[PDB]
């Protein structure tokens, strides 16, 4: 019974690999010869936000490119204004450890999650004069590592118990469940069309789940180590991975295999968070040697290096306009690069 | 253009109030000390927090919280577990911890190997290399009653009990047989085997002995903490 299923799975994987080898006529490193180079991108820190006490773990840019959210391990969620460097709201959290924070596309809700296995949604209207807890949800057995807002009514959450969940803010119960992973689901990312989303875990693979049907479509298993961050391409047909393997990988939802690897022999530290720009030519990835490297998404060459942090950069965010990049590190610092 | 100036002054006043509240909370945050208790499921880690709570806030949701106050010192003890066995992904969060309370069980030598491996992996961690871990030897009365009744497995599972002596000279607890002292010191010397090769001057290991029921534990930690902040400060002014 066991051997007849194991050899069946083995020949299935061999057939899938033969298919990948059949559809692979060439690589992207052979067609990118007659392409103009970008050059040395010299970015400078314009503003410096100093309001965090403990280490900053994650952030999320807004849809208006005006306000951003940030979470630290002190127990507070800080909303920053990137223009005048002013804090408009400060919500004292009940727990001290938070691993993810998400800003709603409408600007009325904000979600936060951490080691308490509880996602706390706060409303930002503030009619009475102080912030209050709208509805907190607790239905996981692992740990909340990532959360994203699909709309003002639905939220996608990544748990550390091999289960991804889609919660509804009104009723507070799980609409669907995604059980396809075999390890702690690290992060997930939303497509601009909000129809399908890719999530990366510590299994050296990313899974492309659907929000309507409730199942996964493709599994890209070509990585080597625990994938940390996943970022869609601005078009919605491909994405990139960032992990501690010191190599950034690019996958596509239609190619179903690798596209191009970004590696270098003079670097040994891993990647913490990746984020594409508005165009997709430059890929910003925060490394583990206290810097953020911007790479060319078509040449696999170091386009630029920003060494402005003295601690490990924990989060990197690019707004929808691409005018500024916010890099938050473990030294309670948020650098605003141009 | 007057409305823009008015809203700007309003936002500036809001920023001033937010900074005032931030400083007010930073005061109590800097006046706060945290401690992280690590151990196995069968290890005697609940008997420490029970005696920390019965003599001197507490929440039971995922992680156990413990509060004990001795000599005007705050302590937030965190007993962390409700998750799966993989404790290597969320271990980067516990980076600013003052000291790691590591407790082990001496009643089971086969169950002590995984605790020794966890201690080795914690000492060899790149993020926990600047945090001194305090080693506690819990369940000593059971070890004493087990080694004397028989079942000699200390030299079978560990082939190092035939070539060993008693370097330290102190016998306050024993009054019947120094074999229990030899068995309690061999485990300490085995735990301090690889702990002195990785860390040279970054973090220190403090082995401490305790029983199943004790009352001077919260004190014993405090003195250890009293040293942990000292040497760190001694390393903050380039003096050693």
């Amino acid at each position, epitope marked *: 019974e066991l051997d007849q299923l194991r050899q069946e799975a083995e020949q299935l994987k061999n057939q899938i690999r033969d298919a990948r080898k059949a559809c692979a006529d060439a690589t992207l490193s052979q067609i990118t010869n007659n392409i103009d180079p970008v050059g040395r991108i010299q970015m400078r820190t314009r503003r410096t936000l100093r309001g965090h006490l403990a280490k900053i773990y994650a952030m999320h840019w807004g849809t208006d490119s005006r306000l951003l959210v940030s979470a630290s391990q002190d127990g507070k969620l800080i909303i920053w204004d990137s223009y005048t460097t002013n804090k408009v709201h400060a919500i004292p959290l009940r727990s001290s450890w938070v691993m993810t924070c998400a800003y709603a596309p409408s600007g009325n809700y904000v979600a936060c999650g951490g080691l308490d296995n509880i996602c706390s949604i706060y409303n930002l209207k503030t009619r009475e004069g102080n912030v209050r807890v709208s509805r907190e949800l607790a239905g996981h057995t692992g740990y909340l590592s990532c959360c994203r807002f699909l709309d003002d009514n639905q939220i996608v959450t990544s748990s550390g118990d091999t289960t991804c969940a889609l919660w509804d803010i009104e009723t507070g119960q799980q609409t669907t469940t995604f059980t396809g992973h075999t390890g702690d689901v690290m992060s997930l990312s939303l497509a601009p069309d909000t129809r399908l989303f890719v999530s990366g875990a*510590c299994d*050296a693979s990313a899974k492309l789940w659907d929000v309507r049907e409730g199942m996964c479509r493709q599994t890209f298993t*070509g990585h*080597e180590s*625990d994938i940390n961050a996943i970022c869609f391409f601005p078009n919605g047909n491909a994405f990139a991975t960032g992990s501690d393997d010191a190599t950034c990988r690019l996958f596509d939802l239609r190619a179903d295999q690798e596209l191009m690897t970004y590696s270098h022999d003079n670097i040994i530290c891993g990647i913490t968070s990746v984020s594409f720009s508005k165009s997709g030519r430059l890929l910003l990835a925060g490394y583990d040697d206290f810097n953020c490297n911007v790479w060319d998404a078509l040449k696999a060459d170091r386009a630029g290096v920003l060494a402005g942090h003295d601690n490990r950069v924990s989060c990197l965010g690019v707004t929808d306009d691409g005018m500024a990049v916010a890099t938050g590190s473990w030294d309670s610092f948020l650098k605003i690069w141009n | 253009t007057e409305d823009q100036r008015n809203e700007e002054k309003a936002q500036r006043e809001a920023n001033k109030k937010i900074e005032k509240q931030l400083q007010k909370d930073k005061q109590v945050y800097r006046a706060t000390h945290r401690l992280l208790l690590l151990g196995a499921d069968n290890s005697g880690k609940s008997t420490i927090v029970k005696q920390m709570r019965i003599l001197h806030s507490g929440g039971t949701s995922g992680i156990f919280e413990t509060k004990f106050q001795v000599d005007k010192v705050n302590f937030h003890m965190f007993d962390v577990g409700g998750q799966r066995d993989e404790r290597r992904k969320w271990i980067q969060c516990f980076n600013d911890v003052t000291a790691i309370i590591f407790v082990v069980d001496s009643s089971d030598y*086969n169950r002590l190997q995984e605790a020794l491996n966890l201690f080795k*992996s914690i000492w060899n961690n790149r993020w926990l290399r600047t945090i001194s871990v305090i080693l506690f030897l819990n369940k000593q009365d059971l070890l004493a009653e087990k080694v004397l009744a028989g079942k000699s497995k200390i030299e079978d599972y560990f*082939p190092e009990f035939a070539r060993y002596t008693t370097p330290e000279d102190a016998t306050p607890e024993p009054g019947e047989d120094p074999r229990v002292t030899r068995a309690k010191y061999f485990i300490r010397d085995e735990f301090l085997r690889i702990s002195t090769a990785s860390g040279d001057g970054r973090h220190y290991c403090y082995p401490h002995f305790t029983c199943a029921v004790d009352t001077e534990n919260a004190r014993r930690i405090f003195n250890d903490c009293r040293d942990i902040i000292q040497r760190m400060h001694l390393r903050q002014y380039e003096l050693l």
Partner: nanobody
Amino acid sequence: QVQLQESGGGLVQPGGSLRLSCAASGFTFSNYKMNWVRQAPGKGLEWVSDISQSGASISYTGSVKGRFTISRDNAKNTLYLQMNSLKPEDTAVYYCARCPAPFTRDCFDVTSTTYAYRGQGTQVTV
């Protein structure tokens, strides 16, 4: 693709000699640490031994210290495990596990949960 294939074993009388092979493919062998775990019938997992990147820092479990030998080959990308002076109580299911972090000496691969960085296992009964 991270995959580990174990070969060797079978019904062997105690007191003889045995050799197990661990074939690794899809990743760099000379930069990752490996180890061995065993599952006893009715008992949990237990570590056996480990090996450094170059192969100098080798540490065994006190149950079998001088009876087990492990050797890595980066040119062939393989691991060899020689076992002599077998004991009848050493029967277990063997797992040739690999450490997820490179350029280090710490590994968390002793738990019996859903782990995806090891082989299918070899049944060695005596």
